[model samples]
Target chain A: MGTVSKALTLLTYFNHGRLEIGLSDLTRLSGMNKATVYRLMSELQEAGFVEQVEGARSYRLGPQVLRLAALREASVPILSASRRVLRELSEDTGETTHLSLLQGEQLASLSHAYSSRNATKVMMEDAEVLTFHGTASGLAVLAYSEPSFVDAVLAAPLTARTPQTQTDPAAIRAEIAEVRRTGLAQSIGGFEAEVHSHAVPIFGPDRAVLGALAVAAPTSRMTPDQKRTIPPALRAAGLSLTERIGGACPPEFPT
Target chain B: GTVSKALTLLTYFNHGRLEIGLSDLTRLSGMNKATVYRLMSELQEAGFVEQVEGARSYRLGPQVLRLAALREASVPILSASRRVLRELSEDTGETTHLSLLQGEQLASLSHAYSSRNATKVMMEDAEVLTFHGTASGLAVLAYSEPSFVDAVLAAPLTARTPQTQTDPAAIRAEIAEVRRTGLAQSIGGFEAEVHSHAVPIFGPDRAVLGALAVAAPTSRMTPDQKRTIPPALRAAGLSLTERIGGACPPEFPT
Candidate 1:
C-alpha cells in the first residue's frame, strides 16, 4: 500500500528460491514501479540491509539484517527467556522442542532444539507462516481463550490439509473445547502427511493465550508412551516460559 | 546495470521462499521479459548462479554459498577467542590482529586496539587480505613447506596496491629466509602508509597453524616500536597456543 510496506515486502522477496534478485525481479515480486524499487533497494543497501556482490550486480539480504535481529533479541521477551527453557525441554524429552509465536495470524517458530540424534527429526521452519484451524500449533494457540477470535477462525473455511483435518466450524469449536479441558492438543496427519504433533497453549504474562510450545515427531517413530509423555513436558515448558516472563520481565509474544 | 539486475535474481532464493518460476520472478522484479531472460542466462554462465531442479526457477549456486559459508564459519573464531584476543589487543596498545591461513586464503579473525587513536583498520569482513600481499603472508608462508610456497607463488596474486609482489622467485626466496628466521616482516606491501610485523601461531602439537600480525602507519611504528611489537606478538601467540585445544588450533584441511 504505502512505500514503507512495499519496501518491507521487498525483504521477503529474498527467500530460498530467489536468494539474489535484481531490480526487475523486485518490481515483479513487489508490484512496485521500476524507479521506486531501484530507489528503495539503493536506500536499503546504504543501510546495510542489502548488499551487491563484488564484481556483480546481484543483491541479497545483507549481514546487517541478522545483526538487527540480534539487536532486537537483546530486549525481546520471547527469545531471551525461551532459549534456555527450550534447551532444557530438549534434554528432558530427547525430542526437538520449540517456541512458536503468533506473528499476526501466522505461526512463526522463534527457537528450537533437536536431541543431538533426531534420526527422523521434524524440521520446523523458522519464519514459517501458518493459518489457524489448519495447523496443530495454530489449534493449540486458538484453543484456550478469546471466544470471538476462535469463532472467527472456525467460521472461516477450514482448509483440509489432510483427511483428518477438522473441517466443520462447530466440530472444530468442539475440538478446541476438548483441548482446553484436556490441556493439550494432539493432531494426527494434520499439518504434514505422516507427522504427529502435540502442543500446549503458552500464556503471556497477562495470562492470555500467546502461542504453542510443541514437539513434532514422525508418527511411526514416536512410541505410545512417548505420545503420553509430551503433554507434561510441553506443560512444564509452557509454565517455565510463563515464570520467566513473570516478575519484572515481560512476556514474549509466544513462549 | 545489466550485472546488477542479474544479481537481484540471486536474492530470491533465501530461507523460506526457496523455489519460484520465471513468471513470478518477472512479476516480482518488474523487469521486462527480454531483460530478465537475458540476465538469467548471463548469470547461469558465470557459475555463480543456476536454475532450481524439478522447478522452473533460479537459485544461488554453490559458489555463492561457498563465499557465504566461508564467512559464517570464519566469524565463530572471533567469538571463540574473544577473551584472549581482547587481552592481546589491549596489551599491544597498538593495533593487534589474529589471522589464520584457511585453504591458502588468509583471514583475520580478531583485532583489538585503543579507540582513542585514529586510522583504525577495519577487519570486520575477515576475508580481506591485509598482509597477504606484504610481509605478514610471507611469515606464515615461510612456515608452510617450500612446495606450498612454490604453489602459492605459481598461483595468481592480485595486487591491492602497486607495491604488491608479482615476481615468484623473489617472493619465494623472501619466504624461505622468513622460514629460517621464524618471523614475517613487511614494510608496506599493502600500503605505503603502514608497516606490519607478523609471527606464526603454532598449535599445541607445534604445527605452524596461523599467523598473528600487527599493523601501524609508518609514522607511529618507528624502528624501536616495530622491534617491540614482534616479541609482544610472539608472547601472545604462545599464550594462545597453550590454551589451544578444540577451539584453538582449528582443524586444517591439509
Candidate 2:
C-alpha cells in the first residue's frame, strides 16, 4: 500500500470507543508490523498529526487537524453548495437532520440541523464520524458505493455500538443489498438505544454514492406512522443534496 | 508576580481583539501594573506570550495555555451544552447557539450552521459580551441574582442598536417579565431587523441555567413566531435538564 494509504489506515484507531489506543491496538487495527507502526507514529507525532493523550499513554488526532480543516474550508468549496439542501432537509424531517459524506473510509458530518420545534430531539452524540459497517447512514452510503469499497468495509472487524447493530460481515452484506434494493437504510437501537435513523443515498455527478442524507429521531417518537413516512422524506432530501453536489459514478456491482 | 494575573491578562485577547498594550491589559484584566509588565516580559521569553517589538503591546504567544492542556478533557458546562446547540442549528432553519453569563459578561459558546439565509447571526465560540446588547444576554440577566441585575442596570449601558432597552425602568420591567414568564426576547435589539428568542435553561434541580436560543430574520417570522418562541425556548431549555438530570454547572470557566 502507498504511504498515504498507510497513514489513513493508522487514523482508523481514532474512533469513538477507541479514542486513545496504545501501539498494540494500533498494530491490530492497522494490520501493519509493530516496527512500521512505531516508525510512522513517531514521524506523524513529530509533524503534529498524531498527539499522545497526556498521562493516558495513547494517541489521537492532534490540533493540526483543526488548522488543516480550517484551511481546507477556506480553500475548498465543500458543504457550501450542500448548505441550502441541508437546511431544507431539517425543515422537512422536523427531526435532527444532517448530511454525512465519505472521507477516507470514514463518514464525517458535513452539515446538519440538530433539533426542531419539538422538545424531544435526537442529537448526534457521535457527530463527525460513524462506523461504515454499523450505521444506517453508513449502509446507505456503502450500498451504493463501489463493490470493492463495500467489500473492504465488510472485511474489517465490525465494532458494535449497540445490541441491535450488525457485526457479522455476511449479515452486513445482506443488509447492504436490501438498502440498495429499497433505496432506504433504517436502523433502530443500533448506534444508540431508543434512537432510530433512516439514511438515503446522495449521488455524485457520476451517479456514485457521494454521501448519505439522514434523519435521526427517538424511537419513541418515530412510531409506525412516522417510520413509514420518513423514508420518502429521506429520499427527497438525498435527491436535493445530490443535485447540488456533482460527482456521479454509480456503485459498481460485480456479478 | 502571580500566575492568576497572567491567566486573566491572557483571556483579555480573543477573536479579532488578540492584542493589547501593557497599560490596557493591566486595566482590562484588573491585574497589578508591575505584575502585568513582568508577566508579559517573562511569558514572551517562554513563548507562551508575545509583544510586538515597537508596538508596546502583547498578544498570545504560540503554545499558550500549554499548562492548562488538561482542561481540554475536563467537561465544563459549555462543553456539556454545546451538542444541543449544534443539533438545534441543524433542526431549526434558523441559526442555533448558546450565550452564557460568566461573572457580569455573556459569551457565545458554540455556533451551529444557521439555517441557510442571507441574514444569519454569525457568532463564533468564546465571543464575550456585556448584558446590555443581545436578547440572549437580557434573558440571562433576567434570571440572575437580583442585586446583580440592579448593579448592572445602574451602570451606563451602551445602545448597541436603536431598539436596545437603555431606559432603566424599561430594562427593570423587562427583567421582571422574563422572570415571571420564564422567557426573554429581544426583537432587533442587537442588530437591526433580527429577532432572538431566549429561555433560561434549568438543571433538573430547578435552578436558572444558561439560555438556549435561536435567531432568524424579521421577514420570515411573524409576531406568532415571536410569541411561540417562549414555549419553543422553554422546551429547548428542558433538553439540557433531561441530559444531565441535575443542575447545570455554574462555573464554566476554570
DockQ values of all predictions? 0.02, 0.02
- Runs of candidate 2 with Cα error greater than 4 angstroms are A1-255, B21-34, B41-57, B61-76, B80-82, B116-118, B203-209, B248-254
Chain B TM-score list for all models: 0.62, 0.77
Q: Tens-digit lDDT track for model 1 on B1-254?
A: 44345556655543345455778888888998787777666655543445754567765433333223222332233444566666655665566677665444565645676564667554442433633476667767777766777677777777777777777777777776776666777766777666777777765445565777777777777677767777777676666655553223333211
Residues A1-255, candidate 2, lDDT per residue (tens digit)? 544336535754453234567888888878899887877776656544566755655776543222222222222233765666666666766788878888867898777776456787876643568777667888888888778988777777888888888888888888888887778888777777888888877765334566787888888788778777777777766765554332332434221
By TM-score, how accurate is candidate 1? 0.38
- What is the two-chain DockQ of model 2? 0.02
Model 1: per-residue Cα lDDT over A110-212, one tens digit each: 7887876567687776776655676677778888657788877777778887887778888777777777766777777777778777787776533467787
What fraction of native interface contacts does model 2 preserve?
0.00
Return the top candidate by TM-score: 2
What are the RMSDs of all candidates, in order?
20.4, 18.7
